[PDB]
């Protein structure tokens, strides 16, 4: 059967668990369209003791304005396509995180932060975000970096310059990030405009049209369970679905995902038999024409971005294919990726496919390790006063952050 999801934990804190040593201790903030997660950087502690505040990045407020259910409690989200594009909800989303993390005393957030952002971020979105973050929250210095390259930075052997493909896959996008001696090669980097949200929406739509007898009993928040728990990506899809064609293998693998009970009852309380549906939804990021989209998908994009390099520099980045983000939770994801890669590498040539030590939380642990290592750097952070002489589109180009384009934004 399904479970049901948690709500309303009590992660309340003091003015803040501010660590010893130098005065600043930064917040580590990860923003993505599935979940926000945030914690103090906890310097001098080798394992992060708690990536605090795991909660769904979706919020509600009363029709008289009287209360705001920002935490895990219909609802709305401040992102579009895994970039933040909001003010009036983005503030109450930040407020919830700071209020649970602890606020020191005065009319600003106390101490510096690393805030995770989209691969490329539209200049206006970083401007709107830095404007919120300096006008309302007043942070003394700020770092912007990428969830994917942070999770890579954690999974590195060392504080060393590296080359690789980051195969990222968040809630509403999956991106192939080629990197060259720590620099994200944003000139020829690519993304597929699909992810876990669209695979879960597809898995909902499949079971809606399979079971019109109870369109209300299935729901997106239950599809998120069977998509994480019981779905798997094929070793190769046209062969997996061929072994699903025979009733003996089908009956051995079709899942009794029962609805909660009050004819054999199943007309109202079905076992919701999922068979090829526990494959189809995972395959969306490899074959997005399953949801009708004409995008090249994660296998042909990896070929298309890779073959644009000189042959002698394709090797030392296929030497670190790095799988990361929420969809890489699927069992078999490494085993699929190394086949899709063997089918396109030169005949004898080596490749290496690494999976993030945690498929998703390593974005935050990466931003933590990054902030801990870069805490006392000057040139690496946007310092508060720089926002009076740079327009808020500005970026510092540290490792695990995007290219900066010398530019300005007109506004009134």
């Amino acid at each position: 059967p399904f479970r049901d999801a948690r709500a309303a934990p009590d992660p309340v804190l003091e003015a803040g668990p501010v660590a010893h040593g130098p005065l600043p201790v930064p917040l580590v903030l990860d923003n993505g369209s599935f979940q926000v997660r945030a914690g103090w950087a906890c310097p001098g502690q080798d394992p992060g003791p708690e990536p605090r505040l795991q909660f769904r990045a979706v919020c509600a407020r009363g029709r008289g304005g009287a209360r705001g259910a920002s935490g895990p409690q219909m609802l709305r989200s401040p992102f579009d396509r895994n970039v933040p594009v909001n003010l009036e909800l983005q503030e109450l989303l930040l407020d919830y995180s700071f209020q649970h993390l602890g606020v020191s005393s005065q009319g600003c957030v106390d101490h510096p932060i690393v805030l995770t952002e989209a691969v490329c971020n539209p200049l206006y979105s970083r401007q709107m975000m830095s404007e919120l973050l300096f006008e309302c929250y007043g942070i003394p210095k700020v770092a912007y970096g990428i969830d994917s390259l942070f999770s890579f930075y954690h999974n590195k052997p060392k504080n060393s310059m590296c080359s690789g493909l980051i195969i990222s896959s968040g809630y509403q996008c999956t991106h192939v990030l080629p990197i060259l001696e720590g620099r994200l090669d944003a000139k020829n980097c690519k993304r597929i405009n699909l992810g876990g949200s669209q695979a879960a929406g597809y898995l909902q739509r499949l079971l809606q049209l399979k079971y019109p007898g109870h369109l209300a009993a299935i729901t997106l928040s239950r599809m998120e369970e069977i998509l994480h728990e019981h779905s798997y990506i094929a070793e190769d899809y046209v062969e997996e679905l061929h072994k699903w064609r025979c009733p003996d293998y089908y009956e051995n693998n079709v899942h009794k995902m029962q609805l909660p009970f009050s004819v054999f009852n199943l007309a109202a309380y079905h076992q919701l038999f999922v068979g090829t549906e526990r494959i189809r939804a995972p395959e969306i990021i490899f074959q997005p024409s399953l949801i009708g989209e004409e995008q090249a998908g994660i296998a042909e994009t990896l070929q298309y971005i890779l073959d644009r390099y000189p042959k002698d520099i394709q090797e030392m980045l296929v030497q670190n294919v790095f799988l990361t983000g929420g969809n890489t939770m699927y069992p078999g994801m490494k085993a699929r990726m190394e086949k899709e890669l063997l089918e396109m590498r030169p005949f004898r040539s080596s490749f290496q496919v690494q999976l993030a030590s945690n498929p998703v939380l390593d974005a935050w642990y990466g931003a933590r390790d990054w902030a801990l290592n870069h805490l006392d750097d000057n040139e690496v952070w946007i310092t508060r006063k720089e926002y009076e002489e740079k327009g808020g589109e500005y970026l510092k180009e540290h490792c695990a952050s995007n290219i900066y384009v010398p530019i300005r934004l007109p506004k009134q």
């Binding site: 503030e91 206006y124 993304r191 189809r280 009708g292 994009t301």
Partner: protein, 107 residues
Amino acid sequence: KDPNFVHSGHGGAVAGKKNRTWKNLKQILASERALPWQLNDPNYFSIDAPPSFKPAKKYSDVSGLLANYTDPQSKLRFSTIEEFSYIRRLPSDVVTGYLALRKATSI
């Protein structure tokens, strides 16, 4: 209490006829395309993946098995004789569902 009490007017629709939030992503991209970009610059839209170079494999609607066939009436695609015996019994409510589920000609 809180990190602020006098939150500034960042540029949502404070009192206009338009919706309260900022410009949506399509409007951010439509305005970002007006900037003095060079040909090599990391534009957020230039990161879009190619259109697929392969023709996309036909997977059946009702069961996900490889589809050799498409129905002249319902335009669903199917793999076996008993799947046709099911597709012709479906209500139009879900036929227009499965076509829209892969964004086919159904509107």
